[PDB]
Amino acid sequence: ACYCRIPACIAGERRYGTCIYQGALWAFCC
């Protein structure tokens, strides 16, 4: 499953792009 995370993805995940969500920037993680 994919999630938005600050400031990076958690172990096991990979960063696929960026989220713009509620005025902040996030790592898009899958």
Would you state the structure tokens that stand for residue 27, as one six-digit string? 């790592």
Cα torsion through 21, 24, 28, 29, rounded to 10: -110
Contact (CB, 8 A) for 27 and 13:
no
Four-CA torsion 1, 18, 9, 30, nearest 10 degrees: 20
Which residue matches tokens 């600050």? 6
Q: How far apart are CA 19 and CA 24, in angstroms?
A: 8
H-helix or E-strand spanning residue 2: none
Question: CB burial class (10 A; 0-12, 13-18, 19+) of residue 17?
Answer: exposed
Method used to obtain the model = X-ray
Say what the resolution is, in angstroms: 1.8
